[PDB]
A paper describes a structure:
Escherichia coli phage SU10 belongs to the genus Kuravirus from the class Caudoviricetes of phages with short non-contractile tails. Here we show that the virion of SU10 has a prolate head, containing genome and ejection proteins, and a tail, which is formed of portal, adaptor, nozzle, and tail needle proteins and decorated with long and short fibers. In contrast to other short-tailed phages, the tails of Kuraviruses elongate upon cell attachment. After binding to the host, SU10 tail, nozzle proteins, and short fibers re-arrange to form a nozzle that extends the tail.
The prolate capsid of SU10 is organized with fivefold symmetry and is built from 715 copies of the major capsid protein organized with the triangulation parameters Tend = 4, Tmid = 20. The major capsid protein forms capsomers of two types: pentamers and hexamers. The closure of the caps is enabled by pentamers, which are bent in contrast to the flatter hexamers. However, the formation of the prolate SU10 head also requires variation in the shape of hexamers and in the angles at which they interact. The major capsid protein of SU10 has an HK97 fold, which is common among tailed bacteriophages and herpesviruses. According to the convention, the capsid protein can be divided into the N-terminal arm, peripheral domain, extended loop, axial domain, and glycine-rich loop. The major difference between the capsid proteins forming hexamers and pentamers is in the structure of the annular loop positioned at the tip of the axial domain. The capsid of the genome release intermediate of SU10 is identical to that of the virion.
Numbering used by the authors:
A (entry chain BN): 52 to 151
B (entry chain AK): 52 to 349
C (entry chain AW): 102 to 348
D (entry chain BN): 303 to 349
E (entry chain AW): 3 to 51
F (entry chain BK): 6 to 51
Write the structure that this text describes.
Amino acid sequence: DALASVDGNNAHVEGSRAEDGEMKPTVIKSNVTQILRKVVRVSDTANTTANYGRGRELMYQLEKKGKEIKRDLEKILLSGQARTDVLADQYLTNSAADPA
Amino acid sequence: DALASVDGNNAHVEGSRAEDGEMKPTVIKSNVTQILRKVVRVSDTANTTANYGRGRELMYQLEKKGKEIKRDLEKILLSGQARTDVLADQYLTNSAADPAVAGLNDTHAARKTGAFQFLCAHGGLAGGVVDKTKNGPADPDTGAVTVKVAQNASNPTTNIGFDEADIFDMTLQLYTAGSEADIIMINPAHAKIFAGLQENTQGSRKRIFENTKQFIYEVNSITDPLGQSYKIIVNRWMPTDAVYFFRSADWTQMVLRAPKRTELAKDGSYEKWMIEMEVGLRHRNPYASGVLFTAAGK
Amino acid sequence: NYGRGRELMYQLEKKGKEIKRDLEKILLSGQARTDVLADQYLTNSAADPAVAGLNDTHAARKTGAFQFLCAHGGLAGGVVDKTKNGPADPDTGAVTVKVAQNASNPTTNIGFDEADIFDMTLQLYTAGSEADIIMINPAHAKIFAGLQENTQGSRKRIFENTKQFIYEVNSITDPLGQSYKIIVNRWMPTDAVYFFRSADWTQMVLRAPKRTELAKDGSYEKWMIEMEVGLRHRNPYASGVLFTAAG
Amino acid sequence: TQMVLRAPKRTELAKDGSYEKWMIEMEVGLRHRNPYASGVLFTAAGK
Amino acid sequence: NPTLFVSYDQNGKKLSFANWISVLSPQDTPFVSMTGKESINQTIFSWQT
Amino acid sequence: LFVSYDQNGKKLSFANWISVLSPQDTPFVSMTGKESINQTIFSWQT
């Protein structure tokens, strides 16, 4: 909400009928969520053999991508992209979602 | 909400994968409220005197108005108005607001509720009232039509009524949908029909009297071929163009502003008062109650 | 979000009831016995040599409905025919599958027979059937109430200075002494009438309905319900079926 | 503020053999009190 | 910023969420209730007459 | 077939507050001073 514009000439008479005046409603701002997804497809064939050059490949890779999603989240939030959705003007009369 | 009508003859093979089904969402209904009002105005002089058969002219006139507002209520809830309102497609108002009619004032039109007829499976409108010359639609899942225009082909054009067989056709539609209606509200001018089940062209449960000193000629209870026992009730404030098949539990009175005391300005020997209350109407399902209109015969 | 909590358990319940609704409709629909096997019970050689090899490319199966298990006397495709009378019992002279003649109620309306219904009870009595129930769609129950007192004339159903109205018939007594009991069925077709007995029909269950969560492979959260059952009839001539035909 | 609908979680998927697949997903958004509460300044020219 | 407070000029309108859903789809199933259940172990069953 | 885009009774997640940046400083008035009077017209001399 925002207060009304300064009325620098709101001079009335000593005694007169008070007028209704003017008001302003609120302004609603809506946003939508985003889906961030990271998956892994490391096999187990090479995981069954005991190798000297590697300890694990599943939990280590999860942590790698477990950090990337955060390193990507920030890159997305600070981006200059535009909100993408097809549910406009469906909040106050949202009794039923967009049939189309 | 209602289940799906994809019953058909679903037949599946033994060694297949689960294929995506057919899912359908719910359906949201919405009704607006209406403002009732009753004003009172009595000069201070008349209110100061002592009438010869009552107290003050203010309270007496207020009580008379406090009762008229209830009568007006019973007549509106049972009317067939089409919920006159200016808004449209703004109930799920979550993505933005409605500034189309925001730069207005009391000049706004008068809001009206959705009466018994408008909330049922009405087939059309007549500007501000439901159209009785159109047969209502059918439910998606079932095939019931809770809004049927009486044929009256059995009875001649001389007497109008609605019908004698069309009463049993609605019970079929209600049972077809699954409604639990057990009350038949009717206008007193049409009670002669439910009691006067005769004039069926010499058949269909006509009449007899065993030369007894008691003459009743009344019908209060009814049972349909399916077993649905109905009880007929009369309402003086009901219109004389339709019959209602409903249940008490399937209706509710939505009250927003209850009637309260309102002392207004005087402006000189006026002593003005006012009564006001905002109320709405609800219906659990448009297909949970029947509306049998009235039409001529052949 | 607000107001809309979940749609998974709610949909499961909806589907849990729909599967049962279909069963009551399929058994009374009148479909035909569908299968890829045939005459594989007396060769005493093997289950089937020519059907083996196909894992899931087979076609769906269908259970013999109320009409198929009776003396239908012909098929009109995937569903039993509602026009050709059933074959006459060789032993007796009974015909349990008939078609309404529609003597009265001129062709202006379809007009299910409303008369000559005692013939079917005769066909049943002639076949030794112990039928005691008449399952019918509610769309034709009025025809049984009018059987009480219409008789296109003067039969004079009486009031006797009473306010209660009934106009409902749920029991009938055949001229041969067979007392039947009328029952309404919302899922029955509007062009058939089933004279039968409960004990003469059994529900063959192989896989009772059970919920089973499937693989996710993403955010699908897939679920399913499955049940495998059949229908049995002791003797075709132990029950009857009366269709409706105007002209 | 950071509006979150689905918090981070390591989900396991089907096993169609030796695949051994896994998943990490989350659903969030972004909220700002007033558009004129923060400022943006673009720096760019022709090329 | 309404000067004359009314219902159509309010940026709010906190909707009234009913706590129920209406359903009429019946599941009488009179036939299935009177038939009786018999468990089998084969996709095909046979009887003699 | 149920998906988030098909829901109807969505209980909105509305914020329980309102933001407004309209300043209310009024520096001048906070330095002038006030002197009560009992007339609609005042005068002084120079």
